[model samples]
Target: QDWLTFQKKHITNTRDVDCDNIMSTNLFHCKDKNTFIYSRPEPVKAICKGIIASKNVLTTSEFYLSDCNVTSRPCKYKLKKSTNKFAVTCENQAPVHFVGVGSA
Candidate 1:
């Protein structure tokens, strides 16, 4: 998840972390905590949060599930893990439930 990557890359030292020094190639900012970095060439975006509940910068598999209807059957999605923010893919249709990510 993007959160782990952020922690590994920026929060490693903890004591030396300069939250203000944060810079990103992605549109999301660490200060905002909750960010949705849209994936290029895809209709989805990664949902992430900084220091959520603890020291974790968490990212979810539910890409844009908060704002879009992305499935109809089972809401299947694939999280592409890489050196940076991961991407997820799902059917181009809304789910039968059509419930927002956490509404269920």
Candidate 2:
């Protein structure tokens, strides 16, 4: 279930994505955080076959994405966009979680 949404919730190649809106609206009320990628799911699936950068964190290749964090009340959020490598945890050959995002 988590991996299912990781692709659906994160990958947005069509529209001008708004992380602030997504992060806040994803849950029934609001989400504390969200990370989005502006790319296809194939490369994302590659991370599962990728070697471990950390114990269970499969290092992913660089990608264009938005990192959103909770800001204030009433479903507000802070958004940060960048292109970098991210650490992910995969299950059943699918990405279930992203540990973090950065250059190193």
Every candidate's lDDT? 0.27, 0.65
List of clashing residue pairs for candidate 2: none
Best-fitting candidate, scored by TM-score: 2
Best by lDDT: 2
lDDT per residue as tens, model 1, 1-104: 34334333322233222333332324223233322233332222123222233221223443321121223323322232222333222222211111122221
Error of 2 at 98 (Å): 2.4
Off by over 4 Å in 2: 50-55
| Number of colliding residue pairs in each model | 5, 0
Error of model 1, residue 85, in angstroms: 26
TM-score, predicted candidate 1 vs. hidden true structure = 0.19
